[PDB]
Design a protein around this ligand. Structure first.
Ligand SMILES: CCc1ccccc1
Length: 162
């Protein structure tokens, strides 16, 4: 088990655009296209992502290419954020996976707002952090996308994905 297998389980796979649990346009393995409510704006983002006219249906190797890019962006997003990096670096290996996973789903800005959860996690207060994350708008709207991630933060094991 690793970050990629973890996210393949949580995000699964779609080969055509859908609205995710926050209502935004998406494809592949949790690849957010845009926050715009216009399908065609999402469609332009996709063609620009792949480098061809799709028109909205991608292959497996292309989905996996996007996935690699998005995992990388999520890690870079953490390391470049002043709120996220010190908390991230205090975390053990498995919880670092849940952190990458959270940012991958929610984006850096959304996650960076969790001021108390960030403090709780850095002070190693696993129980309280998991409770506070379970009150997030992220969790209440994307329950089974988020559930195993919150459990992972609490336990620090891979058992939720087992
Ligand atoms: C709040 C989870 C988290 C912690 C550190 C870095 C990213 C995300």
């Amino acid at each position: 088990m690793n970050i990629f297998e973890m996210l393949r389980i949580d995000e699964g796979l779609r080969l055509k655009i859908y609205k995710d649990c926050e209502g935004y346009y998406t494809i592949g393995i949790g690849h957010l296209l845009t926050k715009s409510p216009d399908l065609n704006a999402a469609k332009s983002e996709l063609d620009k992502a792949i480098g061809r006219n799709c028109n909205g249906v991608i292959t497996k190797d292309e989905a996996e290419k996007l996935f690699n890019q998005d995992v990388d962006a999520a890690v870079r997003g953490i390391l470049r954020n002043a709120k996220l990096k010190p908390v991230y670096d205090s975390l053990d290996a498995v919880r670092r996976c849940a952190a990458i996973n959270e940012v991958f789903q929610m984006g850096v800005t959304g996650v960076a707002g969790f001021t108390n959860v960030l403090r709780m996690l850095q002070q190693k207060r696993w129980d309280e952090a998991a409770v506070n994350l379970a009150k997030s708008r992220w969790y209440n709207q994307c329950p089974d996308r988020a559930k195993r991630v919150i459990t992972t933060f609490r336990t620090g094991t891979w058992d939720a994905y087992k």
